[PDB]
Amino acid sequence: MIEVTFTPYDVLLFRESRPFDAGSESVARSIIPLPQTVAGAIRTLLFYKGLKNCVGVGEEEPEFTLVGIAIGTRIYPLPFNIIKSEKFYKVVNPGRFLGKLILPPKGKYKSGYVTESILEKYLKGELKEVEENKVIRIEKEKRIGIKLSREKKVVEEGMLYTVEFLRIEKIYAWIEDPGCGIKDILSSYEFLTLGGESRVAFVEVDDKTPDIFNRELGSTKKALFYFSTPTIGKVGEIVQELEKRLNAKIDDYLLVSSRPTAISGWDMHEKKPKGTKFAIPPGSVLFVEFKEEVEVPPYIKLGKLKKLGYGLALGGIWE
RNA sequence: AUUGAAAGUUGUAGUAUGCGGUCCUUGCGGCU
Numbered sequence: 001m002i003e004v005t006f007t008p009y010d011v012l013l014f015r016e017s018r019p020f021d022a023g024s025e026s027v028a029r030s031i032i033p034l035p036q037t038v039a040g041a042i043r044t045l046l047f048y049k050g051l052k053n054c055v056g057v058g059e060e061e062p063e064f065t066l067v068g069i070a071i072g073t074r075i076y077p078l079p080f081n082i083i084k085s086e087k088f089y090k091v092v093n094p095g096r097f098l099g100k101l102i103l104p105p106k107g108k109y110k111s112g113y114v115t116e117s118i119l120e121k122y123l124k125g126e127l128k129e130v131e132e133n134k135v136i137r138i139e140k141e142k143r144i145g146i147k148l149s150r151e152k153k154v155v156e157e158g159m160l161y162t163v164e165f166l167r168i169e170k171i172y173a174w175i176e177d178p179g180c181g182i183k184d185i186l187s188s189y190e191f192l193t194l195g196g197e198s199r200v201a202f203v204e205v206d207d208k209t210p211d212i213f214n215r216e217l218g219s220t221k222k223a224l225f226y227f228s229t230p231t232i233g234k235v236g237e238i239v240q241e242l243e244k245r246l247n248a249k250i251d252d253y254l255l256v257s258s259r260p261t262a263i264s265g266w267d268m269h270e271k272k273p274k275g276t277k278f279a280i281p282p283g284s285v286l287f288v289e290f291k292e293e294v295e296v297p298p299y300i301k302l303g304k305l306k307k308l309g310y311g312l313a314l315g316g317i318w319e
Numbered sequence: 320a321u322u323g324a325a326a327g328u329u330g331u332a333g334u335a336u337g338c339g340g341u342c343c344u345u346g347c348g349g350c351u
């Protein structure tokens with residue numbers, strides 16, 4: 001597995017799906033980067049390097065597989081079963097009622113990010129709570145710009161716009177290369193355009209598997225699956241897929257989640273927006289009670305568009 | 320082949336208008 005590290009020179013824009021044309025709708029608000037955007041940046045580099053075989057021009061997916069992405073300062077969205085109570089974010093474990101897994105009422109969820117070490121303790125079921133100071137928020141930087149007339153140096157009519165950028169220190173991407181020679185091509189490049197407004201990020205590439213993908217969790221009936229990237233597909237099909245890949249049937253499951261992630265994007269091949277897809281948002285947790293004990297995998301890919309970085313679930317246990 | 324491409328928060332704008340360092344005060348006492 002190859003590990004790509006993107007270091008933004010300054011700011012990044014991963015624009016939400018909304019009109020953003022000069023002289024009209026003029027507000028661009030960034031979201032947390034979707035893995036397909038990172039995949040697109042890599043595919044575009046290969047598209048220009050002449051490796052159009054691995055790109056998948058006009059195709060939904062490339063030949064290579066983007067395992068997933070993570071932002072860094074490496075941090076992850078607070079699991080949705082972690083609820084803020086006073087100055088602490090408390091882990092809420094599944095309960096049972098009428099023979100069904102439920103999450104007991106303990107307050108509303110508040111968004112935020114935690115370090116990889118805090119997530120690791122969570123996945124091992126050893127995390128009780130997190131002090132509110134260790135819960136990170138992503139910094140935004142709002143910039144307001146204009147367009148000037150060529151000669152008179154005054155603002156052209158209606159040419160004012162606003163961008164809410166993200167201030168991100170690092171983005172990590174992991175790629176499985178079936179022999180396209182991506183590691184060599186990425187090594188030849190120092191930087192690439194990532195997201196909107198022609199912002200660039202420095203590129204480093206190392207041949208390594210992150211330790212979080214190599215954890216030994218043991219065997220249990222009570223496994224959980226933390227989605228680190230958006231996961232596309234019906235919950236039923238995802239659970240069924242999970243049953244097949246682990247060769248074990250499920251007694252019951254509970255999806256703790258939030259607002260669905262709206263995913264469209266821009267088709268650079270056809271020069272028009274991509275079709276809207278809906279996904280289980282990062283930070284969502286699928287609690288599963290298998291009928292038999294399973295060896296909980298450190299990570300597992302689920303749902304549609306796996307090669308674009310979607311459906312990266314991190315294994316964990318609960319009691 | 321990335322909700323992507325493209326867009327100078329710029330142009331005009333005097334820290335200025337009014338305002339007394341003035342009022343009260345014996346170079347004197349006779350001492351060292």
Ligand SMILES: [Mg+2]
Pocket residue numbers: 196197325
């Ligand atoms: Mg632009």
